[PDB]
Amino acid sequence: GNLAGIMHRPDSEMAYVVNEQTVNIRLRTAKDDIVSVELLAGDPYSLRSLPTDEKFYQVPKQMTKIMSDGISDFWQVTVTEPKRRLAYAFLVTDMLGIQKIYSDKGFFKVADADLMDMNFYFRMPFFQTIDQYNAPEWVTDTVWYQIFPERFANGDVSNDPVGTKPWDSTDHPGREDFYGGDLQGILDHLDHLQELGISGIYLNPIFQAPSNHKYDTQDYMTVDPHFGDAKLFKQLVQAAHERGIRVMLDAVFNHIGDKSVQWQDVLKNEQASPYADWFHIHQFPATYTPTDNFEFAADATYDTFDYTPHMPKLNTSNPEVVDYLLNIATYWVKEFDIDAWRLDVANEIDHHFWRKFHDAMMALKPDFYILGQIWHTSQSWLVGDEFTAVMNYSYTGAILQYFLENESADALVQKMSHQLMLYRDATNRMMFNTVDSHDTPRLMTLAHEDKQLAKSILTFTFMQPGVPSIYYGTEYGMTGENDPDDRKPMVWQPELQDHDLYDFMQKLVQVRRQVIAKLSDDKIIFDVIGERQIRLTREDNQTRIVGVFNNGTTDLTVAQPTSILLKTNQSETQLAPNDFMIWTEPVR
């Protein structure tokens, strides 16, 4: 009877509209403290307005315990109501059999609860589809491929930066190196991406900027000339779309580069610049004391990304900045037909701006995908009026920690369960899962070149609800420590490529696209079956996909599956340490 562990927050991920007449409701309780939960629910006005003797509270609805995070249990139910108005309360029974009703007014014995008073209950006052979260269906069928354009392929030596180094995937790049990768190189290798099976390309920034990473934007309205031009970008988008590949660009709106027209005008004109209030300048002249690290100053007189004086923060509260950034966001969509924006440092820009951004994008393309780069929990951006999803760093980070270290399977399952219970169910299917990127060490380096372990991490991640992404070169086993070492030139020489891993990744992508993505409204189940042994199940009403992962130090025997989809051991029943086996079976 741990009443302090019970919570329902109305109008949240715990109470939300799925369609015009249907809502999903959740309740949190302390782990294993509550044995059953029923929902009392119906139209608030029905209690006293309708002449019938029936009352909605006389027909409870059972809730189901769907997940546990080791601290709390989470219960869920779907409710349909034709009047589109809902009052509800929870009947909770603890392990000793003590039942209470829990409502907007607190905890009561049922005999003492004011069940005829609509105001006793929690409320979903009218079911508003305009306020609901919507997931674009095309994302569910996508496997993404992330390209850092300076390092994917050089298709044109004539646009190379001064000082471009010979293309060599065995180099350890410096922070300021150039290798000459560009948009023609991407166009040249679309066949490779189609053969791998990917159906979306995520590019890091491509707009004019002085650096190799291009997060210090000089002009958002121009493709960087070392990458290409507008005609070539249009050609790339149309060629991608012809092959069934969607395109996501990186919007760097939190900060601008110090070589932009706007910041240079501040440096010339100080507070007489018309752009002074496009920034966060505390003292004029806008200045800083240089250090031996180009990306660090201790005392800049203006807010920046991190402490780098080269990335002054934009004032997105200023209506001129809003209009400028919305016009950029609209231009690339309208003129080039991109399918998605990935929003850099999205958490540091205000919600007012992101609501205007969402409204503008959805007015152009109702199926647009808006992905925020946020490393921490992101509930306030994922209500339905701002982003579609965020990068799911905490979820994939938990997976990596489990496979690479020695924690219990229980610990991993608790972390993943906690993550899913932060968000609406449809949101969880839009979250973007990548195990590495241009800002972390490469998978094969984290795995200490253990390819079996890398395959297990990828497969476990590709079974999760979110949408997977492959960082360029993962499919050939590329290594690298953190930035800049995670930005090696792509390995194009066959003698240096891991052909077995490439073949495996094609098979894994196929399972994702042809089997997992094609279940109908599936659910996920996590079972800990032994010391560091996990069974993952995804199932709808016809079909169940099951994956067993043996990450202990002993052999594990399973029943021989009839229809094996993917496995690492030659045996159909035995999993040695770090093996896995994925199979499909009819639901009986």
Ligand X SMILES: OC[C@H]1O[C@H](O[C@H]2[C@H](O)[C@@H](O)[C@@H](O)O[C@@H]2CO)[C@H](O)[C@@H](O)[C@@H]1O
Residues 6+ apart with CB under 8 A from 378: 347, 372, 387, 390
Asked whether position 83 contacts a second copy by CB under 8 A, the answer is yes
Smallest CA-to-CA distance from 70 within 406, 417, 379 is with 417
Cα gap 483→132, rounded to integer Å? 39
Residue 83's alpha-carbon distances to 26, 42, 47, 87, 260, in angstroms, are: 21, 9, 13, 11, 55
Asked whether position 49 contacts a second copy by CB under 8 A, the answer is yes
DSSP-assigned beta bridge partners for residue 19: 22
From 16, 88, 167, 215, residue interacting with ligand X (rule: CB under 6 A): 215
CB of 177 to a second copy, least distance (A): 23
Which residue carries 């946020």 as its tokens?
Answer: 374
Q: Is the dihedral of CA 237, 241, 244, 246 positive or negative?
A: positive
Q: Which is nearer to a second copy, 197 or 312 (CB)?
A: 312
Per-residue burial over 287-304, b = 16 or more CB atoms within 10 Å of its CB, e = otherwise: ebeeeeeeeebeebebbb
Asked whether position 177 contacts Ca ion by CB under 5 A, the answer is no
Cα gap 296→284, rounded to integer Å? 20
Rounded to the nearest 5 degrees, what angle is found at the Cα of 387, between the Cα atoms of 382 and 390? 75
Asked whether position 3 contacts a second copy by CB under 8 A, the answer is yes
DSSP 8-state class, residue 426: H
Site for ligand X in 180-209 (CB under 6 A): none
Residue 298 interface partner, choices Ca ion, ligand X, a second copy, none, CB cut-off 5-8 Å depending on type: a second copy
CB of 87 to a second copy, least distance (A): 9
Residue 12 interface partner, choices a second copy, Ca ion, ligand X, none, CB cut-off 5-8 Å depending on type: a second copy
From 69, 177, 182, 436, residue interacting with Ca ion (rule: CB under 5 A): 182
DSSP-assigned beta bridge partners for residue 585: 544
In this structure, the strands spanning 99-103 and 86-94 are: antiparallel
From 132, 154, 315, 550, residue interacting with Ca ion (rule: CB under 5 A): 154
Phi, psi of 261 (to 5 degrees): -55, -40
Asked whether position 4 contacts a second copy by CB under 8 A, the answer is yes
Asked whether position 306 contacts a second copy by CB under 8 A, the answer is yes
Contact status, residue 529 vs residue 557, Cβ threshold 8 Å: no
Asked whether position 387 contacts a second copy by CB under 8 A, the answer is no
Asked whether position 350 contacts a second copy by CB under 8 A, the answer is yes
Smallest CA-to-CA distance from 201 within 340, 343, 367 is with 340
Asked whether position 217 contacts ligand X by CB under 6 A, the answer is no
Asked whether position 160 contacts Ca ion by CB under 5 A, the answer is yes
Asked whether position 341 contacts ligand X by CB under 6 A, the answer is no
Which helix H or strand E contains 100, and what residues bound it?
strand 99-103
Asked whether position 408 contacts a second copy by CB under 8 A, the answer is no
Q: Which is nearer to a second copy, 64 or 129 (CB)?
A: 129
Which residue carries 């490469």 as its tokens?
Answer: 442
DSSP-assigned beta bridge partners for residue 390: 372
From 33, 171, 277, 439, residue interacting with ligand X (rule: CB under 6 A): 439
Residue 215 interface partner, choices ligand X, Ca ion, a second copy, none, CB cut-off 5-8 Å depending on type: ligand X
**32: alpha, beta or left? (left if phi > 0; alpha if psi -120 to 50):** left
Asked whether position 228 contacts Ca ion by CB under 5 A, the answer is no
Q: Which is nearer to Ca ion, 160 or 337 (CB)?
A: 160
How many residues at the interface with Ca ion, by CB under 5 A?
6
CB of 308 to ligand X, least distance (A): 5
Q: Which is nearer to a second copy, 29 or 474 (CB)?
A: 29
How many residues at the interface with a second copy, by CB under 8 A?
62
Asked whether position 262 contacts Ca ion by CB under 5 A, the answer is no
Asked whether position 38 contacts ligand X by CB under 6 A, the answer is no
From 80, 134, 283, 380, residue interacting with a second copy (rule: CB under 8 A): 380
CB of 184 to Ca ion, least distance (A): 7
From 96, 111, 130, 559, residue interacting with a second copy (rule: CB under 8 A): 130
Site for a second copy in 240-299 (CB under 8 A): 296, 298
Residue 43's alpha-carbon distances to 148, 287, 486, in angstroms, are: 53, 62, 56
From 56, 90, 122, 144, residue interacting with a second copy (rule: CB under 8 A): 122
Asked whether position 471 contacts ligand X by CB under 6 A, the answer is no
CB of 339 to a second copy, least distance (A): 25
Q: Is the dihedral of CA 408, 412, 418, 424 positive or negative?
A: negative
Residue 502's alpha-carbon distances to 63, 148, 455, 479, in angstroms, are: 44, 19, 11, 15
From 295, 367, 385, 410, residue interacting with ligand X (rule: CB under 6 A): 295
Residue 182 interface partner, choices a second copy, ligand X, Ca ion, none, CB cut-off 5-8 Å depending on type: Ca ion
From 142, 159, 479, 550, residue interacting with Ca ion (rule: CB under 5 A): 159
Smallest CA-to-CA distance from 515 within 200, 197, 248 is with 197
From 183, 251, 345, 447, residue interacting with ligand X (rule: CB under 6 A): 345
Q: Which is nearer to ligand X, 465 or 489 (CB)?
A: 489
Residues 6+ apart with CB under 8 A from 536: 460, 463, 524, 525, 526, 527, 546, 547, 548, 549
Give the residue nearest to ligand X (CB).
215
Asked whether position 348 contacts ligand X by CB under 6 A, the answer is no
Contact status, residue 501 vs residue 455, Cβ threshold 8 Å: yes
Strands (E), 520-562: 523-530, 533-539, 543-550, 556-557
Contact status, residue 469 vs residue 433, Cβ threshold 8 Å: yes
CB of 465 to ligand X, least distance (A): 23
Site for Ca ion in 402-421 (CB under 5 A): none
What is the largest distance, in Å, between two alpha-carbon atoms of the chain?
85
Binding residues (CB under 8 A) for a second copy: these are 2-5, 7, 9-12, 29-31, 33, 45, 49-51, 69, 71-72, 83-85, 104-107, 119, 121-123, 125-126, 128-131, 296, 298, 303, 306-307, 313, 317, 347-352, 355, 374-377, 379-380, 385, 393-394, 415, 418
Binding residues (CB under 6 A) for ligand X: these are 213, 215, 252, 295, 305, 308, 344-345, 373, 438-439, 483
